[PDB]
Design a protein around this nucleic acid. Structure first.
Ligand SMILES: [Zn+2]
Ligand SMILES: [Zn+2]
Ligand SMILES: [Zn+2]
Ligand SMILES: [Zn+2]
Lengths: 75, 76
DNA sequence: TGGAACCCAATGTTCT
DNA sequence: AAGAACATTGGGTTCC
């Protein structure tokens, strides 16, 4: 199960086990951008169905689960 | 002259309520189609120009609450 | 694993 | 006003 949206947990992307959709969301969130504002209370439910609803909260728990575009762990 | 649903400036009065054009076609699509949306918050999401896209469930709710309806035509 | 390339759903504007 | 057509966005899977 994906540590963010708990969809089809694929295989560690950018440090964390995630679905494919969260993988791509995160690269996009970091590289491009958009300020994402939560419309609730910064604690939205992020599941398969709702991850689309709050990119702010989804992106936040990407960061908190450890996601990073650097697998430079090679050193 | 602001949309009663989302606070973006209203483009006139639609389905019975002062609204912008985004909320106008949003409400029409939701009412005529399916609107089985789920709130990822507590069914009171703030709905402004940007966040209106976040939560269709709370957006539709605010539409109904402000009184929008399709037959506001022959309802006059 | 990472990412280009789709495809697609859902939204917002235009309609000399 | 109401709504069809079109344009775009942002997003999820598919392919290497
Ligand atoms: Zn996920
Ligand atoms: Zn949120
Ligand atoms: Zn509006
Ligand atoms: Zn909501």
């Amino acid at each position: 199960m994906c540590l963010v949206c708990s969809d089809e947990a694929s295989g560690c992307h950018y440090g964390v086990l995630t679905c494919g959709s969260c993988k791509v969301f995160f690269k996009r969130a970091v590289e491009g951008q958009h300020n994402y504002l939560c419309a609730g209370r910064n604690d939205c439910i992020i599941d398969k169905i709702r991850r689309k609803n709050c990119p702010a909260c989804r992106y936040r728990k990407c960061l908190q689960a450890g996601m990073n575009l650097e697998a430079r762990k090679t050193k």
